[PDB]
Amino acid sequence: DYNLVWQDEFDDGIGPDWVFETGMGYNGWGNNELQYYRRENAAVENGNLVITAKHENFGGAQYTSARMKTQGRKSFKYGKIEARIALPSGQGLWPAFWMLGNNITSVSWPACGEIDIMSRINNALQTHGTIHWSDQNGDHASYGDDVGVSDPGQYHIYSVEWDANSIKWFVDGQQFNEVDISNGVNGTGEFQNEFFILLNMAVGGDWPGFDVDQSKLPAQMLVDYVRVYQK
Ligand SMILES: [Ca+2]
Ligand SMILES: [Cl-]
């Protein structure tokens, strides 16, 4: 049995476990992204976290959005990690609900491990579920899959069920991907550690491309909640 261990329902404001990131990181958050993240692009409305991507000059960027993380505040080793999210559609938009290993501080990326619960690019009727890590050879490895999501503008529960042997991905309880991590095979030992959660919406980058449909801005990513259950 899964029990609720943490949540953020965004009932009246952003809960105490979120840290806001700002700026463009290093080379556009490692992916040549175009937005400058700001605290100001995240708000709560009608019981939802609202991350807004805007066409706005700030800090030398042409776009602003928000990126939030639970690093140093809430981290999890295994669990059913889920979020109820509604996505905007527009060329250049790249929302994500994901996780990074706590040890990012000492081992860097991808050695810290990364669990992309949900990512989407542009107007795609597909979302992705992916892991990134450093295999036994010390190479940037990744394993991922996609699933058809025909109304991404609607709410959908994006989740992973993560345990010592596997990571399973779900959209609305439909399993669409699985990776075996049992006994740390192919350098996946890094997924037996604690991970924090991130939410963001990037504008442009290596994955969605550098064309942006600016007529779809301001664009809102809506997160009704983030919940973590553990057995
Ligand atoms: Ca809510
Ligand atoms: Cl668990």
Q: What share of the chain is helix, strand, coil (3-state, %, to 5)?
A: 10, 50, 35
Contact 76, 6 (CB under 8 A): yes
Residues having C-beta closer than 5 Å to ion ligand 1: 9-10, 47, 224-225
Which residue segments constitute the domains of the chain, with CATH numbers given? 1-231 (2.60.120.200)
**49 contact partners, CB below 8 Å, separation of at least 6:** 8, 10, 14, 42, 43, 68, 199, 222, 223
Query: What is the rounded end-to-end Cα distance, in angstroms, of the chain?
Result: 5
CA 165 / ligand 2 centre spacing (Å): 11
> Is residue 33 marked as binding?
no
Give the resolution in Å.
Answer: 1.8
What method did the depositors use to determine the structure? X-ray
What is the residue type of 105?
T
Task: Indicate which ligand has the atom closest to the C-alpha of 50.
Answer: 1
DSSP code of 111? T
- Nearby residues of 191 by Cβ (< 8 Å), 6 or more positions away: 113, 115, 131, 133, 162, 167, 181, 184
Lookup: tokens for 45 = 């409305």
Cα 143 to ligand 1 centroid, rounded to whole Å: 31
Q: Tell me whether residue 9 is annotated as binding.
A: yes
Dist CA 186 CA 47 (whole Å): 42
DSSP 32: I
* Residue with token string 């943490």: 6
Task: Estimate to the nearest angstrom the gap between the alpha carbon of 9 and the chain centroid.
Answer: 17
| Residue 114 contacts residue 98 (beta carbons within 8 Å) | yes
For residue 155, report the phi and psi dihedrals to the nearest 5 degrees.
-65, 140
* Other beta carbons within 10 Å of 68: 23
C-alpha of residue 140 to centroid of ligand 2, in Å? 27
Element housing 221 (H / E):
strand 219-230
Alpha helices by DSSP H, the chain: 104-107
d(CA 122, CA 29): 18
Q: Which of 212, 226, 225, 171 has its CA nearest to residue 65?
A: 212
